[PDB]
Predict the structure of SMYD3.
Amino acid sequence: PLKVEKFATANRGNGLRAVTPLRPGELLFRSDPLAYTVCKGSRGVVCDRCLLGKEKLMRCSQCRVAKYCSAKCQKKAWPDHKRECKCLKSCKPRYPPDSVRLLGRVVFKLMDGAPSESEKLYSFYDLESNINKLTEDRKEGLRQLVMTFQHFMREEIQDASQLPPAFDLFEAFAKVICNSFTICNAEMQEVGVGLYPSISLLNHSCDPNCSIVFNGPHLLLRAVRDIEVGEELTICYLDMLMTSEERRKQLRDQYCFECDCFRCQTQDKDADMLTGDEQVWKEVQESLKKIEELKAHWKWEQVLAMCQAIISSNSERLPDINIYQLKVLDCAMDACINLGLLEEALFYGTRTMEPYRIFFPGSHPVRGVQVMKVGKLQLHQGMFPQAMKNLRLAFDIMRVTHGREHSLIEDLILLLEECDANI
Ligand SMILES: C[S@@+](CC[C@H](N)C(=O)[O-])C[C@H]1O[C@@H](n2cnc3c(N)ncnc32)[C@H](O)[C@@H]1O
Ligand SMILES: [Zn+2]
Ligand SMILES: [Zn+2]
Ligand SMILES: [Zn+2]
């Protein structure tokens, strides 16, 4: 029996609420995507199917765009790839926007696959589109995505008879905008995008009572606070390292609503997030656009070189509590780890630990994984009591946010065992 249920909220459309009391860590829903694809920067870096990175990937011989970690993944992916394959080939070397490839897989799944378990509570047809709130600028952008879709799908979709009944391409892209999920690997690197329509019932909170984590394309929804019967379930749609002004803009631009929560009313944590000299963090925030772009393409050496230029600058520096400085530190930590610079990684990672405690309150999967990385670096360095403390803290968080059903809990348990045997 389900612990959650769809309901009509008073002023946020449809939502999800608890049917039984919930405790921190309790698994509320599991889902595979209705449809998903690899994101632009991870294309050819991770496997199209399982979203794991490898040093060498096999490509699909027909289109040479889809790439896989194994013969098993390539064969298993063939049904959901067969029709897009003709489209990607005939449109080479033009590669579609991620949302267009995603919507292609939506159409093929809806036309050719059995009804999807991902739609059990809520279907793609049910999804909010926010049409009557879109600006003229947004509508124009969606009209270009429509034509991009029609161009890219020409080989497989000729007319409305190859679409689901009463299927409006404009309205479908509007649904995509405000219901796409960014998929991340175990290390919290962005690797894909997917639609999970039952999960799309969850409304936003800047201080949520639930959390989702991804294990490959599989999505786990867990409570991270006590929740009582009838209480609405919420997740945070946004990066925690954002000011209320930055949250207002993205929630307006992407989700067409204004947030009334306590954090937004009081600009909760804004002042701490923006400490240091404004001119300096303006420039660091500018640079982060290139840094994050490079990182989205796994270009670790260039990421590290840009981050070192900031972290160890000869010009003025920022406190580690500044969110842009914090972001640079994490990018440098993750680069060093992938480049095997483990002493330097531990240096940056340890510096993020107190800012992460402040900005990821309660149980948040992002902080749980960060602490696990630091303790793993400390274990490899022989700092056994210090590693053991952070590994236990990571377990305390990730037992709630990840849970037994997430394979990273297994990896963490082994690290805990290895570190305890040392002690
Ligand atoms: C993923 S859907 C959530 C389910 C949605 N309420 C529905 O009816 O299908 C995202 C949309 O829900 C609405 N929404 C989500 N969180 C909200 C909030 N905190 N306040 C008002 N509306 C919200 C916005 O319309 C947003 O674009
Ligand atoms: Zn694979
Ligand atoms: Zn192919
Ligand atoms: Zn808010």
In short: The chain has five domains: 1-45+181-271, 46-94, 95-180, 272-351, 352-423. The domain at 1-45+181-271 is CATH 2.170.270.10 (Beta-clip-like).
